[PDB]
């Protein structure tokens, strides 16, 4: 209907990772620049995916690298 701005996108990502086991300084502005014109739950899924890449690599704390893997899977990933 309207989509979120660079600011809002980071805000989604930050508020969302609170309930997630995640490593310290993940550059959320940068992650948001990789999800342009991306839906609410699209970004939420990039988090679910990052969580999966962590579990996949037998990890509890999800890397920024796990989020990059997550973006390439969800955002750049054609159905």
């Amino acid at each position: 209907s309207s989509l979120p701005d660079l600011e809002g996108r980071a805000n989604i990502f930050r508020i969302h990772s609170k309930s997630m086991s995640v490593e310290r300084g993940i550059r959320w502005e940068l992650i948001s620049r990789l999800c342009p014109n991306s839906t609410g739950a699209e970004l939420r899924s990039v988090c679910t995916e990052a969580g999966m890449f962590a579990i996949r690599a037998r990890r509890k704390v999800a890397t920024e690298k796990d989020f990059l893997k997550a973006v390439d899977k969800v955002i750049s990933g054609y159905k």
């Binding site: 660079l6 980071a10 502005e29 940068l30 990789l34 990059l68 390439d72 899977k73 750049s76 054609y78």
Partner: protein, 455 residues
């Protein structure tokens, strides 16, 4: 009804702000102002000078308030400035007042300026001044972590970039600065530049275009691979670039890019040396390759060299399906009839490739043999409806589904909600052909369409 009410809400705010002490309710009032400003078209007949003077005063005054949530105020400013008469807005936030604001240390005041600069009328107003120059220094400074401001700067820049005067200030006056950020290549600064540039290429014209800023060297691309996030953004910049080439018939820019493209393909193939490339960027790279096999060139010269030297379509076992789902089917048929004929079959799985291979008539002819009326009815209905719907898209495919697989036509007409979407999609795409083309199929196609939409 006659919405006077809106100006009554603005004047009462103006009063509660100019007061010696401010109330608790102020935030709920500002929220009521923002809500009532979305609704109502450009109306409240008064020059708004008092409330904008009071707002500019409130921002320059850094003053921290226990009750006041500065964001709710700026929300009003964002909604007020565009609706308001810009000539009267220039009185409060003067050309010089903005230079002052953007060079200050008050972040909320800077944002206010960016909302003013966004709503510049005429657009090239501040193109004579260094107001454009300031914004670029803020935008490309990694220390600036204000998300609301960073965006306000870009939202302002995007609006103004339609103007030739604003673009001249960027790619001439500021061109040396822009070039510095590029060679600098600090992740935050650089990625901001990528995103600034992908916006600027929408409005940039053949002469206006400066090769130096929009283009990335082989040695630049390889340097990005370290911080993989940059390489990804760069892959993306180019996939996006090679797309707004076909989507604006800007074939002039194709020379500038053509050069570095094989670099990406090289980097993709090399795994021994760039594990990060194939790990963190496989998909978006495949996307960029899909765009290269689309660009207007001498019988796919660049792409076939890219395929022979680095991509190697078909040699790559696991990738065959992806290649067949993405790469230009016109190209796929020409150079990989083998890959198209041997590896495509009609399955539930196939669908991805089926929808891409169907796009070129010549290509679909090479995969028409894989179409038994039986092989299709083997599938569950949802799969069938996706297959049928895919065939219902083009002239040659509809013509084939109608004439050659009538058993399948029967299945579509018959005797899950996703299944229904695909089916009805197919049903209508078929009825768009007409009574004649359809023949024996028109009468029931309509019957089974009314059945599906009416009730």
């Amino acid at each position: 009804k006659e919405t006077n009410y809106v100006e009554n809400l603005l004047t009462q705010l103006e009063n509660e702000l100019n007061e010696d002490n401010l109330p608790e309710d102020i935030n709920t009032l500002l929220r009521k102002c923002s809500l009532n400003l979305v609704t109502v078209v450009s109306l409240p007949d008064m020059d708004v000078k008092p409330l904008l003077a009071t707002i500019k005063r409130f921002l320059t005054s850094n003053v921290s308030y226990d009750s006041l949530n500065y964001d709710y105020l700026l929300d009003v400013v964002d909604k007020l400035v565009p609706m308001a008469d810009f000539d009267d807005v220039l009185e409060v936030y003067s050309a010089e007042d903005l230079v002052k604001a953007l060079r200050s240390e008050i972040d909320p005041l800077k944002v206010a300026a960016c909302r003013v600069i966004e709503n510049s009328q005429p657009k090239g107003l501040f193109a004579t001044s260094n107001i454009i120059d300031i914004l670029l220094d803020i935008l490309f400074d990694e220390k600036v972590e204000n998300d609301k401001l960073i965006t306000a700067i870009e939202k302002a820049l995007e609006r103004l970039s339609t103007d030739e005067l604003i673009r001249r200030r960027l790619f001439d006056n500021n061109l040396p600065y822009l070039v510095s950020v590029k060679g600098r290549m600090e992740t935050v600064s650089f990625v901001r530049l990528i995103d600034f540039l992908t916006i600027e290429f929408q409005f940039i014209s053949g002469p206006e275009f400066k090769d130096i800023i929009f283009c990335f060297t082989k040695e630049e691309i390889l340097k990005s691979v370290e911080d993989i996030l940059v390489f990804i953004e760069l892959v993306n910049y180019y996939t996006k670039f090679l797309l707004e080439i076909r989507n604006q018939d800007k074939y002039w820019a194709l020379r500038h890019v053509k050069k570095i493209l094989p670099v990406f393909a090289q980097l993709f193939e090399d795994t021994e040396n760039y594990p990060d490339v194939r790990a963190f960027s496989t998909n978006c790279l495949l996307q960029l390759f899909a765009e290269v096999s689309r660009i207007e060139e001498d019988e796919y010269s660049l792409f076939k060299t890219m395929d022979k030297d680095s991509l190697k379509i078909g040699s790559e076992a696991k990738l065959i399906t992806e290649w067949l789902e993405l790469i230009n089917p016109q190209y796929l048929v020409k150079y990989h009839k083998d890959v198209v004929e041997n590896y495509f079959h009609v399955s539930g799985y196939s669908i991805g490739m089926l929808r891409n291979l169907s796009a070129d008539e010549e290509c679909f002819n090479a995969i028409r043999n894989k179409f038994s009326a039986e092989i299709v009815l083997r599938l569950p209905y949802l799969e069938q409806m996706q297959v049928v719907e895919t065939l219902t898209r083009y002239e040659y495919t509809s013509k084939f589904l109608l004439n050659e697989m009538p058993k399948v036509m029967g299945s579509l007409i018959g005797d899950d909600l996703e299944t229904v979407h695909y089916r009805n999609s197919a049903l209508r795409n078929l009825l768009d052909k007409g009574e004649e083309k359809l023949s024996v199929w028109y009468e029931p196609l309509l019957r089974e369409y009314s059945k599906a939409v009416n009730g």
